[PDB]
Structures are given as structure tokens and as C-alpha cells.
Amino acid sequence: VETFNRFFYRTMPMLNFYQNVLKHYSETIQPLRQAAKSSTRGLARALESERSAAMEEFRRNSERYWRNIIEG
Amino acid sequence: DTRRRTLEDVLKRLGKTTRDLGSIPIVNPRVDVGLPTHIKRNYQLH
Amino acid sequence: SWWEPLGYGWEQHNEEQKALCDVTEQRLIDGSNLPFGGKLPPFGTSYG
Amino acid sequence: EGSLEYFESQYRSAERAVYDEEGRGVRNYWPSRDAVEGIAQEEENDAQ
Amino acid sequence: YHAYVPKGASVQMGETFMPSNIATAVFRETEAAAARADKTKEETGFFSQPRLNYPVSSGIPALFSKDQFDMQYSLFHRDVVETLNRHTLGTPLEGHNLETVIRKTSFDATQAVAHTAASEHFNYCFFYKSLRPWGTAPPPRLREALQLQYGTNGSADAMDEVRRIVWVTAASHQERCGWVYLVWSGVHFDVVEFPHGSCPIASDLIPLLALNVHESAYILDYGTSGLKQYVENYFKACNWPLAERYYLMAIG
Amino acid sequence: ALGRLFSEKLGDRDVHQWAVESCADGEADVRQLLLSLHEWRERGRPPS
């Protein structure tokens, strides 16, 4: 068994290489998708919020906006 | 340049300077833009 | 104590600020108010 | 050694004090003014 | 070591692939190179080819293969310069500017050799200086200028229109020997077609862009029918900001 | 050349908007390609 595994390690190193690549993929993939969706939606709601009603209030009077931002 | 209040002079008339706002996403107090704008401009930084 | 009074790299630093920075946040050094006029003095004049 | 140990300890404390102040466990780049300019009570406790 | 390595050769790392035979053939080519270098040092005249601002060891991106451009540079242009030198020595025109050769030989049949060679020398130069390898996007001020003339109610319509008029002008010069220029008349822009042995300085215009419409320019790549494709590519590779600063200097 | 092809196709519209577009939710972190885009356009770098 050792002679065998050793032989195919020294001859064909990249089988273990790719095996470990896929191992790692299947391990870490879903955490990464969570991070992606969360951040993207972060900039998403952040982005659309600029057309909201609160922003329509920002332009007519800025002082009430900033005041109730600091207190709010 | 217009008759709007920046958040800057709102702070000067309240007397909070720049330090007190610290839990708020605004960095540059002297720009004229909404809070959401401030969030999107600094978003890639964190 | 003689290095800070004359802003040394002031024209470069001014250029960098004006081109790459928003005017809301930028500090601009003026050469006129700087010791020699922000320049290097003519040769034999400056006592060295 | 033992300067470095103490030093490192108080840093660790100060930084886990600033970045998550409420101990929720996630990194916060927008800390309250009270957590930033606030002094560690561990210093006072050590004096005591 | 740069001085010691001959003109064409590239200086690189030994991969130890050289069999002794070709290794000796190389030294022999180098010896020959030294000899021909010694004779070119004495054959040197007043004028010379311009140094290229960009590496042409490979082709000019999106435009020329290596062989095309180096058939322009190291074949036609250098002949033009040998001619120019042969005929500007032993004459009142010895050792003057490229201009004062172009301008004082203008419109005379007797000095037609000198004038033709001179103007071709200039055209080739300005052509090389008109090519920026990966191309460039035309600057705002120049776009504003061009739009006020060529543009009909469209956004930078002046760019598509200018790169159209250049195509048309190129196709309308039938002889395939000459140059197409975008120039500033001093009161307005226009795209002019110069025949071989004629130059924008000779007609006292101010050149902005040059395009080489000689058949020898596009033959190795685009064949004999490929002129349209050729021009279209030229605009991928042209240099606008140059044309702009020349324009702005012309105005003041 | 890539720089001006991009600045040509994007045209006027918001960089950030474009970034939220070119990533559907599950595609990639927006902060990453925002960072790499900024560092590529100005401060010209090889794009990641």
C-alpha cells in the first residue's frame, strides 16, 4: 500500500493537488456566497435609498434633516 | 454654493464639532450630500 | 528648525492635492507667503 | 520581556474594546465616541 | 554591454540550447555586423531616421505586423533619407533644418529630388509620431473644436465624421502614392490629401494627424483590396492628444 | 486601451450602480471589484 501510494504520489502529484482543490471548494463555498449576497445587498439598499422620501426631505430643508440625523 | 445648511454648520450651531458624530457613516462633514450618498462613497473601504 | 518654515515640496504637493483630491478636503500651500517666495533664492544673496 | 507582555495585553484589551464594544463578536469600523476616547478600567483596577 | 551588441540582436539569458555550429555562425554574423557598422559610420550624412518612441520589436498593436512596419522603417524611409543626403550635400542646402530644405526647395522642378526626398522624410517622421500603439481617446477640447465644424446634432459626431472623411479622402486618392493629413488651415480644419513628394509644411498648413496611404504600407497585411480595413484599424492605433496640443499651440 | 473602452461603454452612469449590476447577488463581493476597479482606473494598475 505504501509503495503504491508513494509511487503514484511521486509520479502523478497533481491528483492529490486537484483533489485538495475540490475538497477545499466544497468546504468553503457557502460561507463565501453568504458574504457576497450580504455585502451586495448592502450596497443595494444603500444605493436605492437615495431616491427615497427621506432624501426628498433632505433637499427642501437640510437643517431639519441633519438635526434629526444627529438626534436620531 | 447655496442657502442650504451643511451638516458642518449644524454642528457649529449645536457645538458638537466632528468628533461626536462618530457612530454615523459620515467622514467629510462639509460635503453637500445625503447620508446614503456618504454610505455608498465609503462603502468599498470596509 | 530651519526645514519646516520653508515648505519644501509645496508646488508638487499643491499639484497632487488639486488634481487628485476633492476641494472640500484639500490643504493648499501658498508660495508667496513662504520664506523665499517658495523658490530657491538667487545665488550670492541669501547668505548661504 | 514583561514590558512586552503587559503592553501586548493592554493592546489586545483596547482593540477588542474598540472594534466590538458590545461583545456581539463582529468587526465594527464605526465605533461610538465613548469607546474611542474611553480609558480602560483594567488600568484603574490594576492600580487598586 | 549595450554598445558591444550589434544593432538587431537581443541581449538575453543563456538557456544552453546552442549546438557549437550555430554558436559559431552567430559569431561570424557578429563579425560581419561589425564590418558593416564601420562602413555605415562613414556613410552617415547630415539627416537621419528618427528614433521611435515605442518598441516595434513586435508589431504596432492592432495595426502592423513586425514585417510591415519594418518594411516601412528600414526599407522605404531609409532609402528616402539616403537620397535626401546624397542631394543636400554639395549644394546651397548643406546643413540646414529639415524645414529650410523643404521650404526653399518648394515648387521647383530643378531641385525636385531634394524636395521630394525632404517631404517624404517629414511625412514618414510625422507618421511615426502620429501612431500611439494601443491608441488613445480624443481629448475634450479637440472634440469641441471638431464638433463646431463637422458635427451635425450628434454626440462627438465629429469623431465618427472625421474618421469617415479620412476614409473617403483616402479612397478618393487613386494613385496609392501619398499621404492623408488631418490639418489646421489656420482658419478651419480639414482633411487634405497630399500626393507623394508633397508635404503640409510646403503648403504652409499645420499638420495634426498623418495617415500613410502608400500601397507599400498596407500590402503585406491587408492585401491590395484592404484599404478600408487598414484605415479603420489606424484609428484604433492613432494618437489624438498630439493632434490636440498642436491644434492648441496653433491657436495660442 | 482597455481603460478607454471601459470609460467609453460605461459612459455617464454611476460606477457604484454598475457594480451592483454586474454582480447579481451571488456573484462576488462588491467591495472587492469596487476596490480593484478604483485601483485600475486611476492609479493605473494591472486589473485583478
Short mmCIF file of C-alpha atoms in Angstrom, two decimals, chain E residues 18-114:
data_model
loop_
_atom_site.label_atom_id
_atom_site.label_comp_id
_atom_site.label_asym_id
_atom_site.label_seq_id
_atom_site.Cartn_x
_atom_site.Cartn_y
_atom_site.Cartn_z
CA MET E 18 23.11 26.19 -28.59
CA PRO E 19 24.93 23.47 -30.57
CA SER E 20 28.52 24.60 -31.32
CA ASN E 21 27.79 25.04 -35.05
CA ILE E 22 25.14 27.74 -34.84
CA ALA E 23 27.09 29.15 -31.89
CA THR E 24 29.96 29.80 -34.33
CA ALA E 25 27.67 31.00 -37.16
CA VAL E 26 26.44 33.65 -34.72
CA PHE E 27 29.97 34.93 -34.01
CA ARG E 28 30.54 35.16 -37.77
CA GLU E 29 27.35 37.16 -38.23
CA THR E 30 28.56 39.44 -35.46
CA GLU E 31 31.92 39.95 -37.20
CA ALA E 32 30.13 40.86 -40.44
CA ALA E 33 27.90 43.20 -38.41
CA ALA E 34 30.97 44.95 -37.05
CA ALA E 35 32.31 45.46 -40.58
CA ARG E 36 29.05 46.85 -41.99
CA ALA E 37 28.78 49.05 -38.88
CA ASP E 38 32.21 50.52 -39.61
CA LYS E 39 31.13 51.37 -43.14
CA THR E 40 27.74 52.79 -42.05
CA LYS E 41 29.56 55.06 -39.62
CA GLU E 42 31.30 56.72 -42.57
CA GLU E 43 28.25 56.58 -44.92
CA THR E 44 26.40 58.74 -42.34
CA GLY E 45 25.03 62.01 -43.68
CA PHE E 46 23.50 65.11 -42.15
CA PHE E 47 19.92 63.83 -41.80
CA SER E 48 18.99 60.51 -40.18
CA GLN E 49 15.95 58.43 -39.34
CA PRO E 50 14.02 59.34 -36.18
CA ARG E 51 14.30 57.29 -33.03
CA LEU E 52 10.98 55.56 -32.33
CA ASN E 53 9.29 56.42 -29.04
CA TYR E 54 7.65 53.00 -28.76
CA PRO E 55 9.08 49.48 -29.08
CA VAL E 56 8.47 47.98 -32.53
CA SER E 57 10.30 44.70 -31.95
CA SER E 58 6.81 43.21 -32.14
CA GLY E 59 4.29 44.84 -34.49
CA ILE E 60 2.32 48.03 -33.82
CA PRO E 61 -0.75 46.77 -31.92
CA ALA E 62 -3.94 46.31 -33.96
CA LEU E 63 -2.23 47.87 -36.98
CA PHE E 64 1.01 46.35 -38.28
CA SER E 65 2.88 43.07 -38.15
CA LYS E 66 6.60 43.35 -37.46
CA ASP E 67 7.44 42.86 -41.13
CA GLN E 68 5.07 45.53 -42.38
CA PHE E 69 6.29 48.32 -40.17
CA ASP E 70 9.90 47.31 -40.55
CA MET E 71 9.44 47.32 -44.33
CA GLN E 72 8.36 50.94 -43.93
CA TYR E 73 11.04 51.94 -41.44
CA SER E 74 14.09 50.01 -42.53
CA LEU E 75 13.37 49.91 -46.25
CA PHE E 76 11.46 52.80 -47.87
CA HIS E 77 12.12 55.56 -45.36
CA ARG E 78 15.85 54.86 -45.07
CA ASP E 79 16.10 54.97 -48.85
CA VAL E 80 14.36 58.32 -48.81
CA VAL E 81 16.94 59.52 -46.32
CA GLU E 82 19.92 58.21 -48.35
CA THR E 83 18.53 60.12 -51.33
CA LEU E 84 17.98 63.29 -49.32
CA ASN E 85 21.54 63.18 -48.01
CA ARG E 86 23.04 62.46 -51.44
CA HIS E 87 21.35 65.55 -52.84
CA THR E 88 21.66 68.06 -49.99
CA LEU E 89 25.47 67.90 -49.89
CA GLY E 90 27.46 70.00 -52.37
CA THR E 91 24.51 72.35 -52.72
CA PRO E 92 23.49 75.63 -51.08
CA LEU E 93 21.20 73.49 -48.86
CA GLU E 94 24.03 71.88 -46.83
CA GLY E 95 23.40 71.69 -43.12
CA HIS E 96 20.11 73.43 -42.71
CA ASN E 97 16.90 72.47 -40.93
CA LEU E 98 14.51 69.94 -42.37
CA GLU E 99 12.26 72.98 -42.93
CA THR E 100 14.61 75.24 -44.72
CA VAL E 101 15.24 72.31 -47.04
CA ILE E 102 11.54 71.68 -47.59
CA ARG E 103 10.60 75.29 -47.87
CA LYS E 104 13.46 76.54 -50.04
CA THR E 105 13.05 73.59 -52.45
CA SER E 106 9.28 74.13 -52.75
CA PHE E 107 7.71 74.24 -56.24
CA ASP E 108 10.88 73.97 -58.32
CA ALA E 109 11.46 71.33 -60.91
CA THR E 110 15.26 71.54 -60.82
CA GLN E 111 15.50 70.65 -57.13
CA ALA E 112 12.60 68.17 -57.31
CA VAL E 113 14.87 65.40 -55.97
CA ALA E 114 15.80 67.29 -52.83
#
